[PDB]
Ligand binder design. Structure first.
Ligand SMILES: [Zn+2]
Length: 660
RNA sequence: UCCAUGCGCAUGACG
RNA sequence: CGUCAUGCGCAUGGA
């Protein structure tokens, strides 16, 4: 169970040597890691000491994979193993699998929450001193406010207390192992910047060395066939809409101060909405919202079939008319805006069918490779989800070769779409592995255990060096067809990825060949520095929220600056959600639902929240994101997008008020 | 297995 | 500091 190249890199770790390890894809780093584990435990048998190993990840899926495939098949006999998650409904808490279970595979924030329970007295606590070893995958996330940097800051604080005792007079601490791919470089154009980054990493891990492979590079090169770095790089309907935009700009005096079809315009639009919410005036924030929609339509039209933007806006104003009618079941402003749209709606639909594109060059390259390969595996990357659905439906519209494809996105329920499911992600992955799905359409979710592939493209994308190497890792089978499709500095960015991959080795070779004294000095300095940083950060955070006012305010709608609620009439449930009972409120809102939690809408048509069902009660839960404040102390209005921004506190709900 | 919500994190681009 | 897009983890309540 030992490889030659793995041997030396394991070698220091076996006796002290809290280290880092970095190797490419496919080197079976899990296997050498397992060897370190088994050897550590056998040493603890020889010493009859507390052999405890905990494995940390960033994602649940790797936990499950390693529990299935790596750790059990080599330690299912000797030792206790268990693979943990946040979702695996565990019958006991964490401190019991600490009291048992020599081997743990788990997500980090599980542990971190347990540590907080320790230092809070919450549920029975747990500390690092309960361990003899820690093992990590993907160290390169180990930066400021990362998932698990907090653990290391605790570890470092305890190390420095140990130093203070040592000079003073020293409790033990666990050995720490770190693994990764290329450890990434962060915000660099300089070798010195990158060296500082790496040293900061190692001090955040309290490492001794990286211990990359140099000796047996040929035997490993024989394993890894590498891909080939390649470049395959390649209206009036739009202008009608730009004319509508200018018309509306004139309609409410809107100075863009920049071009159409970018973020800066969107940024200014949202800032206008903010100012108009500070004002409570219409024609200004409403236009910000509409123009935001139009800019969406623009910067998809730069890349997408115009029919999709027409569908976007058709559904948009459809929902708008639904809102206004459900409320009425109108103003010159909304009337103008609606009629300005609908007077062109059907004609613009007619324009939508016309041809005249990146899409064309794209289809050409696609058909070229699927004719070449003839078993063919294909991946598509891009920025957004709606892009994926649109291209899937579009290629389903386009005939043909007969290649079959499917979309893919993440899981965050944000910003446009009902997200996918982990089960369904695994499902589509198995469909692709089967050959049922020939071509995948994905966001960065792919950059996973996807099958060996050929033609990972970049259709209007930018990625960083870690993402570049992670995209490299999956393209295999002695055929790489890296492709890139953007319009108008994107070669620059793959060039940057190459440059950074060079800089990383240039830095690694300098730091490996460094004094141990000066290395330890700089890492200790960075540790103290980061610890001071975290301390000051916690200081400012505690100083942040101190008000806890029961009621000081009035909540108003944002389209209409109409009163909606008071500071005291609100109540809290789940210590998460907010509600306004006292049906003096209930005389206000209107309900809507189409397709079980119905949504709320205003007396103007403003959407407000959801009717959340809790303990039989159908409580109207609202979102601060769609409301505005008027403080008693301060007249100027404010807007937060989140309750937590507001320091002042509201009470937990008491059902004793609502009986009969 | 699905749904809704809250919170935190990172990344890229943008100012 | 803010915005956007993307991805991730955790905690909830319900079915
Ligand atoms: Zn209103």
């Amino acid at each position: 169970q030992l490889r030659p190249y793995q041997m030396e890199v394991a070698q220091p770790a076996l006796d002290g040597k809290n280290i880092i390890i970095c190797l490419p894809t496919g080197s079976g780093k899990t296997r050498v890691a397992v060897y370190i584990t088994k050897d550590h435990l056998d040493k603890k048998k020889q010493a009859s000491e507390s052999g405890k190993v905990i494995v940390l990840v960033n994602k649940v899926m790797l936990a499950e994979q390693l529990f299935r495939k790596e750790f059990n098949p080599y330690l299912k006999k000797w030792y206790r193993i268990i693979g943990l998650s946040g979702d695996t409904q565990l019958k006991i808490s964490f401190p019991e699998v600490v009291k048992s279970y020599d081997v743990i595979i788990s997500t980090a924030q599980i542990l971190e929450n347990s540590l907080l329970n320790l230092e809070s007295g919450d549920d029975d606590g747990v500390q690092l001193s309960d361990f003899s070893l820690i093992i990590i995958d993907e160290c390169h996330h180990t930066n400021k406010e990362a998932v698990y940097n907090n653990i290391m800051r605790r570890y470092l604080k305890q190390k420095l207390r140990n130093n203070d005792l040592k000079k003073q007079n020293a409790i033990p601490l666990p050995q720490i192992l770190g693994l990764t791919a290329s450890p990434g470089v962060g915000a660099a154009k300089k070798q010195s910047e990158a060296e500082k980054h790496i040293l900061n990493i190692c001090a955040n891990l309290d490492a001794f060395t990286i211990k990359t492979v140099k000796e047996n590079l040929g035997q490993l090169k024989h394993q890894i066939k590498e891909p080939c770095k390649k470049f395959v790089i390649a209206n009036p309907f739009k202008e009608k809409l730009l004319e509508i935009m200018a018309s509306i700009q004139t309609y409410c005096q809107k100075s863009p101060m920049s071009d159409f079809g970018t973020q800066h315009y969107e940024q200014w639009a949202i800032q206008m909405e903010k100012k108009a919410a500070k004002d409570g005036n219409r024609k200004d924030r409403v236009c910000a919202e509409h123009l935001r929609k139009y800019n969406e339509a623009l910067q998809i039209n730069d890349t997408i079939r115009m029919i999709d933007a027409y569908s976007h806006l058709e559904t948009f104003y459809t929902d708008e008319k639904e809102k206004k009618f459900a409320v009425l079941n109108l103003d010159e402003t909304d009337e103008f805006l609606m009629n300005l749209f609908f007077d062109n709606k059907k004609m613009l639909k007619k324009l939508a069918e016309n041809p005249k594109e990146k899409l064309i060059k794209l289809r050409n390259t696609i058909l070229e490779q699927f004719t070449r390969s003839e078993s063919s595996r294909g991946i598509i990357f891009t920025k957004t989800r709606q892009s994926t659905y649109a291209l899937s439906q579009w290629i389903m519209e386009n005939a043909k070769v007969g290649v079959k494809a499917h979309h893919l996105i993440g899981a965050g329920h944000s910003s446009e779409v009902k997200p996918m499911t982990q089960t369904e992600q695994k499902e589509v992955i198995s469909k692709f592995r089967t050959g049922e799905i020939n071509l995948l359409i994905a966001t960065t979710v792919a950059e996973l255990d996807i099958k060996e592939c050929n033609i990972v493209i970049r259709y209007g994308l930018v990625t960083n060096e870690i993402a570049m190497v992670q995209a490299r890792g999956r393209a295999r089978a002695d055929e790489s067809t890296y492709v890139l499709v953007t319009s108008s500095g994107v070669t620059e960015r793959e060039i940057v990825n190459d440059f950074r991959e060079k800089m990383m080795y240039k830095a690694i070779n300098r730091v490996q060949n460094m004094k141990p004294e000066e290395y330890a000095h700089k890492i200790l300095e960075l540790q103290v520095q980061s610890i001071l940083e975290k301390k000051m950060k916690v200081k400012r955070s505690i100083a942040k929220q101190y008000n806890d006012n029961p009621s000081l305010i009035t909540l108003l709608c944002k389209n209409c600056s109409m009163l909606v609620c008071s500071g005291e009439n609100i109540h809290v449930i789940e210590k998460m959600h907010h509600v306004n009972m006292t049906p003096e409120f209930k005389g206000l809102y209107i309900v809507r639902e189409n397709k079980t939690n119905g949504e709320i809408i205003c007396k103007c048509g403003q959407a407000w929240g959801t009717m959340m069902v809790h303990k039989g009660l159908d409580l109207p839960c609202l979102k601060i994101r769609n409301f505005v404040v008027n403080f008693k102390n301060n007249s100027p209005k404010k807007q937060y997008k989140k309750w937590v921004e507001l320091p002042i506190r509201f009470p937990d709900l008491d059902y004793s008020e609502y009986c009969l």
